[model samples]
Target chain A: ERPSDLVVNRLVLFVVKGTATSTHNTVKPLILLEELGVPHDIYVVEKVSAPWFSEINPHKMVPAILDRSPDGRDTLRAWASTSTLMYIADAYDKDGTFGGRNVQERSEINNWLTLHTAALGPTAKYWLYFYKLHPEKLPKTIEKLRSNITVQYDILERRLNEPGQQYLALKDRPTIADIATLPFAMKSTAELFGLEFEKWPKLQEWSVRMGEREAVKRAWQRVAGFGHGEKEYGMLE
Target chain B: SERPSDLVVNRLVLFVVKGTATSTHNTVKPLILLEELGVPHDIYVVEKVSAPWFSEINPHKMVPAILDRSPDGRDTLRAWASTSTLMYIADAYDKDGTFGGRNVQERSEINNWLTLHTAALGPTAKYWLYFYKLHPEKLPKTIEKLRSNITVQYDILERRLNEPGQQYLALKDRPTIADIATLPFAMKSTAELFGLEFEKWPKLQEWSVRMGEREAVKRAWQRVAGFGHGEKEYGML
Candidate 1:
């Protein structure tokens, strides 16, 4: 038998900052790409004075993806993290395991992703800001952050704790929701800023399992130099 | 014909400072209610000391909720901002005509818009705040995502605003709850964030300007000036 040749038709160039750790949102699309086992190239967006990156994404946002179709068309640049995740999942994933196969599942995935952006992301940023950036701000400001985090965690806990659930939404495999969400959860736990996974054992286990993935490990190693330190005083419960 | 009974249904009290305004996340519900019913309301400013009591007003500790006083002198409070108020007013006052369409299709359209605002606009707005105001380190990605998401929403709303016959999402002739619920955030984006540019989304600009001309909306503008720091305190009953 002649040696089989595989022609790679899609060229995905992921423009990400060298400092993006596995704990960051940028890890999301990388994980999806790995799980899909797609052939792609990762371009570390240099922080130096460069025109190409700036020309591609004027905003200078890292983790921007440029997808060049094998047919020699102009590349499609995606700048947002969640949007990149959806695009990759939709365009590349043939098994429909990473993304929802149907409308309802996709909607549910969107709902969770929205929850991450709206609730988890905001609350976590507030925690980091108040504790790290502006400590002089009034204490009550953190109260809202605390409340939001608790409410969000409780919701996630309930979902993870649901009977007969192997994952957040679907039965067996992780969806985009999981990939979109895992980075934040892992960051929260790693920082240990009183946002303990132990409170929700199931969620803790899920985070651990997600952390065990090779894709997550690769992304983490790539962004190893980025320093992420917890700024807030831990809550006592 | 049956004699008409003089039964005052109920008075719903929304305790708010005359001008103490909500940030984009907090302003959706009350404005929608006032716009839907075309009713004048009393906004009680809760001073810094009054906010704790206000928090007691709803255990959820969220703002822009209503306290409904029954005709029998019992006061029942229904809290949670946007969606709750929309549901309450539609069910109690039969104000669906002002919200969306009187017909099912119209109603669904209204619900879809409302859901989009809640599910998309509100969350993305919150994230923008976190990125711009709180965490400038993540500014690039944050701003990019916000720009994309807001633009996507603006495109949808712009098309609706520029529809050949209909002026608003819900009705062809007049503004509906979809308009009311959405316009506040639009105004906040334009005025506060300086995000809305007329040249970018012409129809959105026109729709916003039209809504800006409403008496209720003009009155709502007064609330904007009073939005400053510090919580409100209400005395114990």
Candidate 2:
């Protein structure tokens, strides 16, 4: 753990891919940061210099974030989307609204977040990538992807549609589970693959409602060198 | 999450081939139980018809689930390999003190270790398999990225092994869930995949040796060798 007095504020920097129209897991921290009205800077890393980006993220991945702490300590850098998101929620969001209120709620949120990474995210990515990017080999890959996705999405849909339950676990408001899951759900719709989320009405509604948030809208605006009202292809540099 | 009505002896009717293990993860659970308890079981390999029947026992299309028919006219099936198997043994064989020391702290420690392996080691290793072995050609960049990610985890595990306080991860006195859950993956990587070299991490190497020396682990190795090559060696034996 770093020093408690580390000053973290608007000086926070999010490093991400420039043309990534959809946000990745790592970007969720920044979204939450924006939601909390924290001042932050967005660093758009280009595709051609992906290796240089990887140097910053030893894991060679996107949505890596580095922040100047509020206490004026050394910078805090984290790779992977989920860890970064949770760090922001824990460190900056001091208000327990974004993550969870208590231990059980936190564990529940962590459980779903874990499920997103372990089950849904990988399966969804493969399904979308195969269908959209590698259509020729989609037939061979789709079955495995479909089986994984169906099992996972069924679990999520069941939770969302739990008897008379509205949200995932706790009833009233969204937690980290929602934030962790939203990016992948958005990607699924944006990619427009034959994979249908229509069967999961609550899940679909959850994704749509999350997208409707001003913070989410602003996050997308900062994503891929695009402004809030700009067309998809207009911001390609 | 309900407790069993009695000390119901849950038997895992494993359909293993003459030589094959039940599963990569599942086979190890029974082996750990058998080793820790010093008990003999009816390990069998199911024929073609038996395979379909076994599928009915578990709809998830995985292996190593327990089937229990209590003396007091109660029947319960605990399916899925990892947590369920641990739960079965923890509840049924609490007398032996095999999992951890017979104490509340020890039991929770065991659970934590198992959970850590399931959440961290399993996912990282699976990602490694996807990138390096399974779909290397199609997802080269993704695979490379995963390799970097998994390596970091390996380093963390290595650091934990180097920590002076313990022989096993959570348990200071004996090998518990931490050893049982992880040993198989370590074995798979070092012996089968030839990915993790013992020379690099001496403490992990020593710990692996201690774990492999157990009789149950040796039995699992015999089973694993049979499965990889021929159809005669299915999990139903």
Candidate 3:
């Protein structure tokens, strides 16, 4: 079940920090790649638009990938952290834990992933922009992002409060949905928004549970120094 | 398994706004799916500016809450995987896997691109409306920030499209829901209004045209154009 001819390390991930798209974009995939024990390497790239990098992901953004076929000749490249992680899950995670267990689980995972992507993910980005990227503080925009994020977080808190809820998709187990929302939900990115735990008890509880996973820690280690110029990715240490 | 009722075949997307000024693909998404699959769907246009009954449908009380019978047919906002709606229909109805991906890797790639649009491109483009038009005060700097944000997203698109030498954004051989998911926001004409020069990003210019030219896409476009700005601005009107 291997494309023996593919490059020894068939999967290569390109990541950068301090860009318009942020750490979670890269970290979500980073965690799953580790969790699944996929054979891969990650590079903390700076010259993103550099010719070589462009060859990898034309979008010239962080969180891209180059995948090799099992039979191994075709070099397939893709980008955006969420899908990149999905690709790894689909192609690599044969046991069906990280992606979804079966068809319905997969659909449920996709459903929550969409909710996370279209709704909450942006608030986190806006939160970052107004809080981190803005040259000067703009309260209206900052307030806008804050209120929007809080409203959505409240909705999620309520969802998690629903009967038999263990994770975002209510799956009793973690899936891409939980992974996708972690950056916004956990302490990792919470301080950016000055998140108050009491305000979103369910989300706070869920966030802590996610961060506690060993895979998340390992993934965080790979990217802990990312955004700064200090780190670069290579074969997983 | 054939659905017991044809309702499963029907895809309803609650599109908000009518006039071109307020047009959103929240409508176009399902139309694309319906056109591509030729599965029957009903497209309802609501004037979100003033709609009382609709609030219960979307809860957010907005345009674009998809409704159909249940294998549990149901239906989000907050970063909106703009493609989330698109993906749902495609996955459910495109059982043959035409616009939807046939394999896990392919689906992941499609999902990745779908997410890029919902999470990054669509929101960045919203500044076309959100930053200046929606502002009670036409804040110049904020307007400039959104404009620049759009450019950043387009630049990424240009690179992403060019990287694989693919005509479509998400795949090499055919257009998936990813391409369909983005059409409402990335159509060529909007690019011009954004003052983006296609000459600057040949790949995007090319992809947009490719996306727009499809028969199904054209059909969807017609469906969009056919709708009246039948906006209900409320009792004042």
TM-score: which candidate is best?
3
Encode model 3's per-residue lDDT on A14-72: one tens digit a residue. 77654424566788888888788777766666566577766555566768887776555
> Which model scores highest in DockQ?
3
- Model 1: residue A100 alpha-carbon error in angstroms: 1.1
Model 2 scores a TM of 0.56
lDDT of 3 at B28: 70
DockQ of 1: 0.06
TM-score of chain B of each: 0.75, 0.75, 0.79
Off by over 4 Å in 2: A1-11, A17-22, A47-56, A68-73, A128-138, A186-191, A226-237, B1-121, B127-237
What's candidate 3's DockQ score?
A: 0.34
Off by over 4 Å in 1: A1-23, A48-59, A69-73, A187-192, A223-237, B1-121, B124-184, B187-237
All candidates in order of TM-score, best leading: 3, 2, 1
User: Per-residue lDDT of A1-237 in model 1, one digit per residue for the tens?
Assistant: 111221123534434333423337567777777777776655544341355554443334555566654345444555446656656765687667887764334434544664565467656655666655662543445665666777777767767876766676565778887887786676454355566567777777888888888887776664443232231111101
For residues B1-237, could you state the per-residue lDDT of candidate 3 as single tens digits? Answer: 121132222334334356453365566776767787877655554534345555333434445455544445333211123365565566567887788887655675677677778777776676456756657444566667778878877777776676655677767888888888777666667766777665777777778887777888888777666666336331111
lDDT of 1 by residue, B89-157 (tens): 554455446553564334434544554565457666655666566544422544554656676777667
lDDT of residue B147 for candidate 2: 54
Clashes of 2: 25
TM-score of chain A of 1: 0.77
In the range B173-237, model 2's lDDT, one tens digit per residue, is 57875577777665535434635455676776777888889777787666545553565343323
